[PDB]
Design a protein around this motif. Structure first.
Motif, mmCIF file in Angstrom:
data_model
loop_
_atom_site.group_PDB
_atom_site.id
_atom_site.type_symbol
_atom_site.label_atom_id
_atom_site.label_comp_id
_atom_site.label_asym_id
_atom_site.label_seq_id
_atom_site.Cartn_x
_atom_site.Cartn_y
_atom_site.Cartn_z
ATOM 1 N N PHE A 37 39.493 44.829 47.077
ATOM 2 C CA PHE A 37 40.033 44.419 48.471
ATOM 3 C C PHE A 37 40.658 45.531 49.157
ATOM 4 O O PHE A 37 41.217 46.192 48.262
ATOM 5 C CB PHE A 37 40.646 42.938 48.482
ATOM 6 C CG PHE A 37 42.053 42.853 47.851
ATOM 7 C CD1 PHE A 37 43.228 43.096 48.593
ATOM 8 C CD2 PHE A 37 42.088 42.693 46.524
ATOM 9 C CE1 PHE A 37 44.321 42.750 48.212
ATOM 10 C CE2 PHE A 37 43.286 42.142 45.902
ATOM 11 C CZ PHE A 37 44.550 42.359 46.752
ATOM 12 N N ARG A 38 41.046 45.367 50.201
ATOM 13 C CA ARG A 38 41.761 46.460 50.994
ATOM 14 C C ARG A 38 42.384 46.124 52.251
ATOM 15 O O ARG A 38 42.152 44.790 52.579
ATOM 16 C CB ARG A 38 40.608 47.363 51.616
ATOM 17 C CG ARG A 38 39.700 46.986 52.634
ATOM 18 C CD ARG A 38 38.804 48.137 53.088
ATOM 19 N NE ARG A 38 37.900 47.525 53.925
ATOM 20 C CZ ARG A 38 36.568 48.401 54.589
ATOM 21 N NH1 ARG A 38 36.555 49.688 54.061
ATOM 22 N NH2 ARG A 38 35.986 47.826 55.426
ATOM 23 N N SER A 49 33.938 44.263 47.676
ATOM 24 C CA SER A 49 33.004 44.247 46.845
ATOM 25 C C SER A 49 33.482 43.368 45.775
ATOM 26 O O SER A 49 34.606 43.179 45.636
ATOM 27 C CB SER A 49 32.618 45.718 46.318
ATOM 28 O OG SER A 49 31.554 45.562 45.460
ATOM 29 N N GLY A 50 32.313 42.600 45.141
ATOM 30 C CA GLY A 50 32.672 41.906 43.872
ATOM 31 C C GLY A 50 31.733 41.858 42.780
ATOM 32 O O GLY A 50 30.380 42.228 42.959
ATOM 33 N N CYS A 96 42.153 45.900 43.106
ATOM 34 C CA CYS A 96 41.164 45.210 42.287
ATOM 35 C C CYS A 96 41.909 43.972 41.944
ATOM 36 O O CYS A 96 43.159 44.096 41.735
ATOM 37 C CB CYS A 96 40.648 45.827 41.595
ATOM 38 S SG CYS A 96 41.765 46.654 39.950
ATOM 39 N N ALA A 97 41.292 42.904 41.820
ATOM 40 C CA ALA A 97 41.916 41.730 41.081
ATOM 41 C C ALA A 97 40.643 40.866 40.389
ATOM 42 O O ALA A 97 39.374 41.235 40.563
ATOM 43 C CB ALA A 97 42.211 40.753 42.525
ATOM 44 N N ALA A 98 40.976 40.113 39.718
ATOM 45 C CA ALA A 98 39.892 39.251 38.534
ATOM 46 C C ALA A 98 40.085 37.821 38.536
ATOM 47 O O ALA A 98 41.272 37.209 39.079
ATOM 48 C CB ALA A 98 39.950 39.995 37.266
ATOM 49 N N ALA A 99 39.363 37.155 38.374
ATOM 50 C CA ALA A 99 39.434 35.746 38.162
ATOM 51 C C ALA A 99 38.176 35.109 37.121
ATOM 52 O O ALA A 99 37.299 35.957 36.970
ATOM 53 C CB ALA A 99 39.016 34.962 39.436
ATOM 54 N N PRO A 100 38.493 33.970 36.684
ATOM 55 C CA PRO A 100 37.438 33.368 35.750
ATOM 56 C C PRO A 100 36.421 32.722 36.205
ATOM 57 O O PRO A 100 35.155 32.516 35.642
ATOM 58 C CB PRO A 100 38.356 32.262 34.887
ATOM 59 C CG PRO A 100 39.518 32.353 35.599
ATOM 60 C CD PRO A 100 39.681 33.255 36.454
ATOM 61 N N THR A 101 36.457 32.483 37.641
ATOM 62 C CA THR A 101 35.371 31.846 38.516
ATOM 63 C C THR A 101 35.326 32.529 39.597
ATOM 64 O O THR A 101 36.157 33.314 40.103
ATOM 65 C CB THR A 101 35.640 30.497 38.640
ATOM 66 O OG1 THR A 101 36.880 30.163 39.336
ATOM 67 C CG2 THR A 101 35.862 29.691 37.449
ATOM 68 N N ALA A 105 38.718 32.836 46.800
ATOM 69 C CA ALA A 105 39.493 34.099 47.068
ATOM 70 C C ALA A 105 40.907 33.867 46.337
ATOM 71 O O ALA A 105 41.370 34.778 45.700
ATOM 72 C CB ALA A 105 39.360 34.546 48.291
ATOM 73 N N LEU A 106 41.442 32.786 46.710
ATOM 74 C CA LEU A 106 42.761 32.417 46.155
ATOM 75 C C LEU A 106 43.059 32.605 44.700
ATOM 76 O O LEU A 106 44.111 32.913 44.398
ATOM 77 C CB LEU A 106 43.132 31.054 46.604
ATOM 78 C CG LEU A 106 44.547 30.397 46.590
ATOM 79 C CD1 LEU A 106 45.243 31.147 47.648
ATOM 80 C CD2 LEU A 106 44.353 28.986 46.618
#
Length: 120
Positions: A37-38, A49-50, A96-101, A105-106
């Motif tokens: 994200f930017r 992008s993801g 950059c960021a990461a999640a299990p699902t 976005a939160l």
């Protein structure tokens, strides 16, 4: 115990190219989805992008399609953002960021200090 560290920013001429890196450490196996994200000063965060690390599915904002490419290197526990044909509108801090699902976005987390991209 997950941490992401962004690098690879810089100043480039319009039309130029940069490759950003998102280097992960910790117990990252749960964090199957990664985004870039930017944020530009006085603007809202935009997801550009993801990627699903497990399946290879990708997402791109419309305005970067054909220009940016997200990819992964599992031996280096890194996700990259290739940015080609850069435009003044791409100027921002990138995280950059990461999640299990991949539902909200939160739920993306663990961004670092970011890296600055300036196009002029």
């Amino acid at each position: 115990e997950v941490q992401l560290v962004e690098s690879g920013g810089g100043s480039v001429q319009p039309g130029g190219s940069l490759r950003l890196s998102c280097t992960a450490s910790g117990y990252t196996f749960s964090q199957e989805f990664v985004i870039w994200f930017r944020q530009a000063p006085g603007k809202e965060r935009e997801i550009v992008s993801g990627i699903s690390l497990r399946k290879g599915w990708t997402y791109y904002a419309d305005s970067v399609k054909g220009r940016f490419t997200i990819s992964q290197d599992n031996a280096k526990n890194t996700v990259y953002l290739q940015m080609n044909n850069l435009k003044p509108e791409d100027t921002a801090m990138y995280y950059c960021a990461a999640a299990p699902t991949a539902t909200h976005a939160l739920y993306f987390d663990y961004w670092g200090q970011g890296t600055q991209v300036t196009v002029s």
